[PDB]
Amino acid sequence: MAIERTLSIVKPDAVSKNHIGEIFARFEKAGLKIVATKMKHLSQADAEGFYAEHKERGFFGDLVAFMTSGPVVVSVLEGENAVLAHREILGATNPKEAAPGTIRADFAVSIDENAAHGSDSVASAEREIAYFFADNEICPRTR
């Protein structure tokens, strides 16, 4: 259908075990294009701001701790049906419920340590992308 952009995060687990390349390759093989990317070590404030909607939930602290335990790679992916297609390759949030051959199935150890993040929707994608990237930071493909 229409060209969408979605946020990817390779989480501290997948980075520490050096799966950045393999994961990126999954994106690109499925036809998604990386139009922005950067490695970051999120501060407590960064993670808390990003996951702000879950501020009152029981798992908030766990989530913040895991996402600040080490450097991540934050990326913007562009393509047809990007949000859902990205979601398909990632697999279920729960790696034990994730289908074989997906990123979570292949690289995730647990719920907390589930390798990668992807935006849940187009609406969530715009906010998440805007959280990590200035609009002039997202590089159109020339060439």
Place this chain on the structure above:
Amino acid sequence: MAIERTLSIVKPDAVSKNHIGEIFARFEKAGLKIVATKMKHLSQADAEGFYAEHKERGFFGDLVAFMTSGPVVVSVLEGENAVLAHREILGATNPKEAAPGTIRADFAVSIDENAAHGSDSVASAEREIAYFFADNEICPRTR
């Protein structure tokens, strides 16, 4: 077996052909760790500054034009013997002279569009890394 850092650039050809993941994976498979990375679209000044040592060369204009023709990915790779090790997996600058299985052999179409850059020495690596990255930008692995 002393740990070094070297600069990697995925050039606009390999980026436009969506080989970022595959190339990254080659790095990680070789025991190198990605400790910094970002996608950038180099300005003419950016490119001219980085390649300043070739300013007087005839091919300078072609080099700058190609390296500004589209987005690149600049990265810092870390590991034992990183400079030389990176150059081994990259292969010869000329893809016709590159060994099988190297990045240039697999992803380069020509000498001009040869997929990727790697620092040629420790002195140049220290300069190239500092050109694109603040020390505070290079993320040590904490897990």
